[PDB]
A paper describes a structure:
Here we identify the bacterial esterases, GloB and FrmB, that activate carboxy ester prodrugs in Staphylococcus aureus. To establish the structural basis for FrmB and GloB substrate specificity and enable future structure-guided prodrug therapeutic design, we solved the three-dimensional structures of both S. aureus FrmB and GloB. FrmB and GloB have distinct ester substrate specificities, which are supported by the structures of their active sites. Additionally, the finding that mutation in either frmB or gloB is sufficient to confer POM-HEX resistance suggests that the two enzymes may work in concert to bioconvert POM-HEX into HEX.
GloB is predicted to be a type II glyoxalase and a member of the large metallo-β-lactamase protein superfamily (INTERPRO IPR001279). SaGloB hydrolyzes S-lactoylglutathione with a specific activity comparable to previously characterized microbial type II glyoxalases, but SaFrmB lacks appreciable glyoxalase activity. We also solved the structure of SaGloB to 1.65 Å, using selenomethionine (SeMet)-substituted GloB, and molecular replacement, using metallo-β-lactamase TTHA1623 from Thermus thermophilus as a search model. Four monomers of SaGloB are observed in the asymmetric unit with each displaying crystallographic symmetry. SaGloB exhibits the classic αβ/βα-fold that defines the metallo-β-lactamases, including glyoxalase II. Also consistent with previously observed GloB structures, SaGloB shows clear electron density for two zinc ions coordinated by six histidines and two aspartates. Density for a water molecule is also visible and appears to be coordinated by the two zinc ions, as observed for human glyoxalase II. On the opposite side of the active site, SaGloB has a 19-amino acid flexible loop, which is partially observed in the electron density. This loop is positioned such that it may cover the active site to sterically hinder substrate access. The GloB active site channel appears moderately wide, explaining why extensively branched substrates are not tolerated.
Residue numbers in the entry: 4 to 98, 104 to 105, 107 to 211
């Protein structure tokens, strides 16, 4: 019923995801290289209805403004990182040309329906305070939380190691053991495959 596609883009190889149903598409983490994203959006030939952000670090939002300027769609994210968009010290870009001037819509933990797309939102902070995981019937998009044999870094702004470990162990590890998990970087993994992840402790 849904098809998930991806491009790996930008300075730090961010996974941008395209979620299609029979009649529309939503985009998650438009990281950069917006002409490549737009090219695939034009290939899909279904109207883009929304952008979802797992979080608002610079490498997940670099193409947000270009896509909104072209298609005029809402951008959804957790309110705890609204101030990340315009603030390069908070989103990490301060460290050559990244900000977003969009006014975002807030999303909270719970069941959601956006333009015919039904999914569950989990608030999974620790790598960032507004990190969200988006759970669909046949896959989940987890952001910079649980990687294949790795974990999101917890030394960024408002990051915290024990918070992320709890988010992974108490929320992401409640999903179906073989559900494909698609993180912000690197290949997919699953809850079963990450049971002995060595970065989780406590
Ligand atoms: Zn990040
Ligand atoms: Zn990232």
């Amino acid at each position: 019923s849904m098809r998930i596609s991806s491009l790996t883009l930008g300075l730090v190889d961010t996974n941008t995801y395209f979620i299609e149903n029979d009649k529309a598409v939503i985009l998650i983490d438009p990281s950069g290289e917006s002409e490549k994203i737009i090219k695939k959006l034009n290939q899909i030939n279904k109207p883009l209805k929304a952008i979802l952000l797992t979080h608002a670090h610079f490498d997940h939002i670099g193409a947000v403004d270009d896509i909104v300027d072209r298609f005029d769609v809402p951008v959804y994210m957790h309110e705890a990182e609204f101030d990340f968009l315009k603030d390069p010290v908070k989103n990490g870009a301060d460290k050559l040309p990244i900000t977003s001037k969009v006014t975002p819509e807030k999303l909270n933990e719970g069941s959601t329906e956006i333009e015919g797309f039904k999914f569950n939102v989990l608030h999974t902070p620790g790598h960032s305070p507004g990190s969200l995981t988006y759970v669909f019937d046949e896959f989940a998009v987890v952001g910079d939380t649980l990687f294949n044999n790795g974990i999101g870094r917890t030394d960024l702004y408002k990051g915290d190691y024990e918070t992320l470990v709890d988010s992974i162990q108490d929320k992401i590890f409640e999903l179906e053991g073989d559900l494909p998990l698609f993180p912000g970087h690197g290949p997919y993994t699953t809850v079963d495959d990450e049971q002995l992840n060595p970065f989780l402790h406590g």
